[PDB]
Write a protein that binds this ligand. Structure first.
Ligand SMILES: NC(=O)c1ccc[n+]([C@@H]2O[C@H](COP(=O)([O-])OP(=O)(O)OC[C@H]3O[C@@H](n4cnc5c(N)ncnc54)[C@H](OP(=O)(O)O)[C@@H]3O)[C@@H](O)[C@H]2O)c1
Ligand SMILES: CCC[C@H]1c2ccccc2C=NN1C(=O)/C=C/c1cc(Cc2cnc(N)nc2N)cc(OC)c1OC
Length: 161
């Protein structure tokens, strides 16, 4: 399976100055739960932002840098390399990867952050006309998680007739 994994706000902002614009621990727990034991594919900037590989799953970084070498990270140099990756693969970001992959993935795990943040990077537009809502679950609010948010699992609709 090839899936997108992303958090975007009401205007599809996903990032600002190479960081997530929001502080929302529950979404990172969501990410952890979904991707543990599987594979993350991310652009070089997204990797450098996180700073190191995330434990207990395969970290794959897409970059044109042939000198790129990071312990615990596997490197690829073209989109076509993604399709050779075994198992469940999650497109992890950032803007560039999402734009390149949104027309190619089976499904998307989207956390909608129900707010409006200042951003400099965005998820591509999409329409629910193309995507079935396999599930929609409101995130729980509390002390450490103060921004309303919704976990969507979207599956690409088949065009029939
Ligand atoms: N909210 C979310 O869910 C979420 C998801 C992840 C990241 N973010 C964010 O997204 C932002 C950054 O996105 P971004 O687009 O600027 O950077 P990015 O997608 O993370 O990575 C950019 C880079 O990946 C490369 N790359 C992409 N396609 C390639 C290809 N076909 N062949 C070879 N290399 C390729 C390049 O590396 P080289 O330049 O080294 O060649 C490139 O400059 C940040 O602000 C960050 O916080 C948010
Ligand atoms: C609960 C522990 C948190 C932790 C972790 C620890 C150990 C093992 C696995 C993981 C799983 N990922 N974890 C992270 O800190 C990742 C954070 C992160 C992520 C994303 C991507 C992302 C963000 N959000 C969404 N929905 N899609 C996404 N694709 C982007 C980031 O910066 C730009 C991140 O850094 C803040």
């Amino acid at each position: 399976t090839l899936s997108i994994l992303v958090a975007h706000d009401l205007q599809r902002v996903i990032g600002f100055e190479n960081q997530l614009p929001w502080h929302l621990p529950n979404d990172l727990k969501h990410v952890k739960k979904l991707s543990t034991g599987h594979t993350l594919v991310m652009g070089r900037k997204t990797f450098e932002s996180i700073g190191k590989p995330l434990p207990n799953r395969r970290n794959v970084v897409l970059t044109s840098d042939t000198s790129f070498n990071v312990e615990g990270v596997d490197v690829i140099h073209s989109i076509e390399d993604i399709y050779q990756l075994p198992g469940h693969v999650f497109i992890f970001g950032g803007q560039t990867l999402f734009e390149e992959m949104i027309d190619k993935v089976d499904d998307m795990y989207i956390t909608v952050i129900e707010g409006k943040f200042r951003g400099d990077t965005f998820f591509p537009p999409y329409t629910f006309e193309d995507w079935e809502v396999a599930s929609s679950v409101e995130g729980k609010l509390d002390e450490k998680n103060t921004i309303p948010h919704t976990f969507l699992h979207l599956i690409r609709k088949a065009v029939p007739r």
